[PDB]
Amino acid sequence: IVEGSDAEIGMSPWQVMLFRKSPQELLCGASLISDRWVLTAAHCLLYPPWDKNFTENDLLVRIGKHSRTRYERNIEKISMLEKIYIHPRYNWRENLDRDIALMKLKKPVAFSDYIHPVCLPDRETAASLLQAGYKGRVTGWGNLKEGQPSVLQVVNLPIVERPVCKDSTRIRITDNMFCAGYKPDEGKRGDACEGDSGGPFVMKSPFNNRWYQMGIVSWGEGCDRDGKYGFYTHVFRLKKWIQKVIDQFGE
């Protein structure tokens, strides 16, 4: 996260760290959406142009964390994965359209002060909240500049109008994406960065005080460049797929 600040304890209790087993390293962010389902970006798990194609036993998740590197006893939970599910129409060849994946934990995690799931938006929440100028929040342990933080970082960023997003890049943007960040005339900075991808873009609903995950950190061109914006998977647009995976499990 570029130009963010240290998260408070328990500020983002749905934050998940996706960890590669061998070699040991932080891969990506992710989010807890129930006691046993974790949401992330498909490109964190599958990106053939860079020879990325992880299987369940290649990975683990760490939930409840604050420190990037320390083992947090009696606070964090380390979980194995039973199964990865990638959106069947995830477009890794072109523009990361439908950049979304689900991971089923081998055993559900117990909730605590530090571990708690985020909500997913319904139609009305998405229509109401996903509007240009409204701000959401991104969190992660990724790079501080286009260099790693001691603890979880947070920054709030405004959603940007689609024509401004499109004029900023030669990459093809779809309706399964949105962009966020400050414009060059707004005097403020901030972006997600490498290491943050797969993590959540969340909004606190003014109607019911709940936090909703509207986006997933997906792609960008560098980090915090003037006239560039971060791009996020539009979670609500892909929700029917999420619901199908969860609903069909064990049936």
Binding site: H43, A192, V217, E221
Partner: peptide, 4 residues
């Protein structure tokens, strides 16, 4: 390109 990709977030990674």
């Amino acid at each position: 390109x990709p977030x990674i």
